[PDB]
Design a binder for this molecule. Structure first.
Ligand SMILES: C/C1=C\CC/C(C)=C/CC(C)(C)/C=C/C1
Ligand SMILES: C/C1=C\CC/C(C)=C/CC(C)(C)/C=C/C1
Ligand SMILES: [Mg+2]
Ligand SMILES: [Mg+2]
Ligand SMILES: [Mg+2]
Ligand SMILES: [Mg+2]
Ligand SMILES: [Mg+2]
Ligand SMILES: [Mg+2]
Ligand SMILES: [Zn+2]
Ligand SMILES: [Zn+2]
Lengths: 389, 386
C-alpha cells in the first residue's frame, strides 16, 4: 500500500458523511439523517402510579399540563410538518459546495458573540471551560481516563465560536489548544474506545464541522431554516453534535459489568435524548433572556408559536425516554440544559452584556492539562497564565 | 364519652406541644429544633468513577465537588465551623420571648412578600399557590386530583413567608388559605388516604413552621442571634421552609405502592439530608439570578457559600446510597432547575413586580380556591379561571 495523503475537499467530506450516515426517514436527507419522525410522537397523561425503578424518576420531570404555570413557558402546540423538505436543504448545500472556494478569507474568524474576544486560542480556552461544565452537568467527572473524550467535547464546542474550515480541521492545520483532530482520535484509541465507536464519533464531528461552517459561510442557509421548526431543529442538533458527544459520554459512564452497549440498538433513544437537550438549552436560554436575537436563534420569527412547538416536542421526547433501556443516563442528558444553562459562565456571560468572566486560579489549574502548550502559536504561548504548577 | 372541649392553645402551648412531639435532636435541649444528623461530621468519599446503572448517583443533578471552581457563581468548598451545639441557647431565648409576648400582634396579617404591589392577602395566597404547584412539579409530582390536599399543604407552607400569620389564628381557623382552614387541609389529607401518623407528622411540621416563620417576623432579636452561625442559621431556615413536612407528603404521593407507608421513623435520616440539600440549592441558584438582575462575591458572603456548597455535596453523596434516592436526589437538587424557571424568582429579578397569571395558569389554580369562604374584597380573585 503506497503512502497516499491527499486531503479531502469540503465537497468530498460532505459526500463521505452521506455515504456513512445514509438517508434518514426522508428520502434524500443524507447526511441530515434522523430516525424518529417527531411529528408522529404522542403524549399520554401520566398515570401517577410508578415503580421505584421507573424512568420518570431520572432527569427533570415537568408534565406538559403544568407548563402554563411558568410564565416563561406556556402551553404546547403541534408543529406543521416541514420534515419532508430536508432534501431541499441538502440540494441547496450540494449546490453551494459546488461553487464555494476551498478556502474563505474569514476562515479562523471569531464568532463567539463576545466582542472582547480577539485570540482564537483564548476562545478555545473558554470553550474548554464550557465543555467540562456540560460534561459535569450530564453527570460526568473530571477523571483522567476520559481526558480525550473531554477534548472531543472541546472540538464540539469551538466551531460554534470560531469559523473553522472543514479542510483545516481535517488536515491538522487547525489545532484546538494545540491538539490536532487526529491527536483526539489517537487519544480515544488509547482510552479503549472501540474503532467502530470512534468512527461514529468521528463522522459526527465531520458533520458538525461541516454544518457549523456552512451556516457561517452560506448567507442563504439560516434564512432557509428559520420558521420551519422541524427542519431548523434537525439542523441545530447537528451543529450542536449532542449525538456524537452522547455516544462518548455513554462510553465513559456505562459500567461494563452491566453488559456492552449495543449502539445500533440504542440509536433511536440516543437521537431523542440529543434533540431533547437542545430544546432545554433554548428553553433555559429564553428564561435568561439570551435566546432572542442571537444569529442562530432556533425560534426566530413567530417566537411564541415556535416555542410552543419546541415544548410540544420536548415533553414527548422525555416521556419516550422514561421507557428506554438507558433512561438512567439519557433522561438527565435530555433535560440537562435546565440546570447547566443557569449555572454556566458561557450563558451568564451573555446575560452580563456578552462579556467574559475571568478564569480564576481554581478553574485554570483544571484546564491546564488540556493545553498542549508545545503546539501553540507564539501569540498564544501565555494563555491560561494562572494555571501552571 | 368525653365532654366537648375546644379551648385553643396558647402560642407557648403550641411551642411546648411540638417540643414533646419532636423531642431533642443529637443535641440535648434542642427540642423542637431537632436534627439527628450532624452535618459537620459528614465525610466526602472519593469517586471511583464506576457506577452501576442502578446507582443512585444517576438521580437528580450530579456535580462533582472538584468541578465547582469551573462555575464563576460557585467556587471551592470549605468545612463550616460547628455551632450546632449552641442550639439550646436559641431555644431558651425563644422561650423567653413567648413567656412575655402577646398572643396577638399589631402587624399580624401584614404582607411581607417583598413585592410592593401586593395589597390583598388572598391574591398573595394565589401567587403562593402558583409557586407551590411549580415546586411540586419540579420535585417530580403531577397535577392529578388525588393529591389536591397535599398541594394545598404546600400552599400553607409557602404563605407564611409572604404573610405574617399568627400561629393561634392559623390553628383556630381564623386564618384561611384561599378559603381553606388548616383543619380543611388535615381532613382532606385523611380523605386522600394518608395514614393518621403521617398526617400528624406533617401537621407538627406545619405547626413548627408557622411558629418559626412568625417568631422571626415578630422578635427582631432572633435572626441577629442566628446570623454568623451558619450551622444554626441553616437549621432554622430549613424549619421555616418546612421542606421536611412537604417532603413527607411528596414521598407519600410519589412512592411505589408496593413500598410500605413511608413513615418518618423509618427514613428520618435520608429525609433530613434531602431537606437540607434543597435549601442549599436555593442559595446556589439565586446567585445566578443576581446576575440576571443586573462572580464578585467576596469576604464573608463568599466564605458562607463555600460552607453551603461543602454541606450540599456531602448531603447529595449520602443520598446516592439511600433507599429512596429515586425520589430524594431530585428533591435535594431541585432548586438548581426550579429557581431559574419559576415566576416567584423571575418576578424578583424583574424588579420585585408581579407577572400576570395567564388564562392557562388561572384554569389550573381555580379548583384550589374555596370561593365560598373568601372575604368579599377577594371574591373577584382569579377572574380568568373559569
Ligand atoms: C454537545 C454539546 C453541548 C450540548 C449542546 C450545546 C449547548 C451546544 C453548544 C456548542 C455547539 C457550542 C457545543 C456543543 C457541545
Ligand atoms: C418546601 C417549600 C419549598 C422548597 C424550598 C423553598 C423555595 C421554600 C420557600 C418557602 C419558605 C417560601 C416555602 C416553602 C415550601
Ligand atoms: Mg442560489
Ligand atoms: Mg450554534
Ligand atoms: Mg451558539
Ligand atoms: Mg463570512
Ligand atoms: Mg423565608
Ligand atoms: Mg423567602
Ligand atoms: Zn414532520
Ligand atoms: Zn456541627
Amino acid at each position: 500500500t503506497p503512502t497516499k495523503m491527499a486531503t479531502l475537499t469540503t465537497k468530498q467530506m460532505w459526500q463521505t458523511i452521506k455515504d456513512y450516515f445514509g438517508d434518514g426517514f426522508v428520502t434524500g436527507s443524507a447526511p441530515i439523517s434522523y430516525n424518529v419522525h417527531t411529528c408522529d410522537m404522542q403524549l399520554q397523561p401520566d398515570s401517577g402510579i410508578h415503580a421505584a425503578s421507573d424512568g420518570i424518576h431520572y432527569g427533570v420531570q415537568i408534565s406538559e399540563d403544568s407548563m402554563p404555570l411558568f410564565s416563561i413557558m406556556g402551553d404546547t402546540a403541534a408543529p406543521p410538518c416541514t420534515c419532508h423538505r430536508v432534501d431541499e436543504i441538502v440540494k441547496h448545500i450540494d449546490e453551494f459546495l459546488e461553487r464555494a472556494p476551498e478556502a474563505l478569507p474569514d476562515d479562523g474568524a471569531i464568532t463567539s458573540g463576545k466582542p472582547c474576544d480577539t485570540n482564537p486560542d483564548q476562545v478555545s480556552l473558554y470553550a474548554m471551560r464550557d465543555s467540562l461544565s456540560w460534561w459535569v452537568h450530564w453527570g460526568g467527572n473530571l477523571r483522567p481516563e476520559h481526558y480525550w473524550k473531554q477534548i472531543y467535547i472541546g472540538f464540539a464546542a469551538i466551531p460554534d465560536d470560531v469559523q473553522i474550515s472543514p479542510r483545516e480541521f481535517l488536515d491538522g492545520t487547525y489545532r484546538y489548544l494545540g491538539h490536532t483532530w487526529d491527536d483526539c482520535l489517537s487519544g480515544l484509541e488509547e482510552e479503549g474506545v472501540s474503532p467502530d465507536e470512534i468512527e461514529f464519533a468521528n463522522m459526527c464531528m465531520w458533520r458538525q464541522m461541516l454544518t457549523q461552517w456552512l451556516e457561517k459561510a452560506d448567507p442563504e442557509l439560516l434564512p432557509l431554516l428559520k420558521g420551519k421548526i422541524s427542519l431548523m431543529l434537525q439542523y441545530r442538533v447537528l451543529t450542536a453534535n449532542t449525538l456524537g458527544c452522547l455516544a462518548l459520554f455513554m462510553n465513559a459512564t456505562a459500567d461494563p459489568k452491566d453488559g456492552p452497549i449495543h449502539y445500533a440498538d440504542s440509536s433511536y433513544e440516543m437521537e431523542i435524548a440529543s434533540v431533547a437537550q437542545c430544546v432545554t438549552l433554548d428553553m433555559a436560554k429564553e428564561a435568561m433572556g439570551i435566546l432572542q436575537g442571537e444569529r442562530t436563534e432556533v425560534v426566530a420569527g413567530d417566537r411564541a408559536q415556535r416555542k410552543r412547538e419546541l415544548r410540544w416536542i420536548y415533553v414527548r421526547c422525555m416521556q419516550i425516554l422514561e421507557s428506554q433501556p438507558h433512561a438512567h443516563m439519557l433522561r438527565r442528558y435530555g433535560s440537562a440544559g435546565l440546570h447547566y444553562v443557569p449555572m454556566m459562565d458561557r450563558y451568564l456571560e451573555r446575560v452580563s452584556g456578552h462579556t467574559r468572566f475571568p478564569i480564576r486560579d481554581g478553574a485554570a489549574r483544571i484546564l491546564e492539562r488540556f493545553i498542549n502548550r508545545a503546539e501553540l502559536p507564539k501569540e498564544s504561548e501565555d494563555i491560561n497564565p494562572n494555571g501552571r504548577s
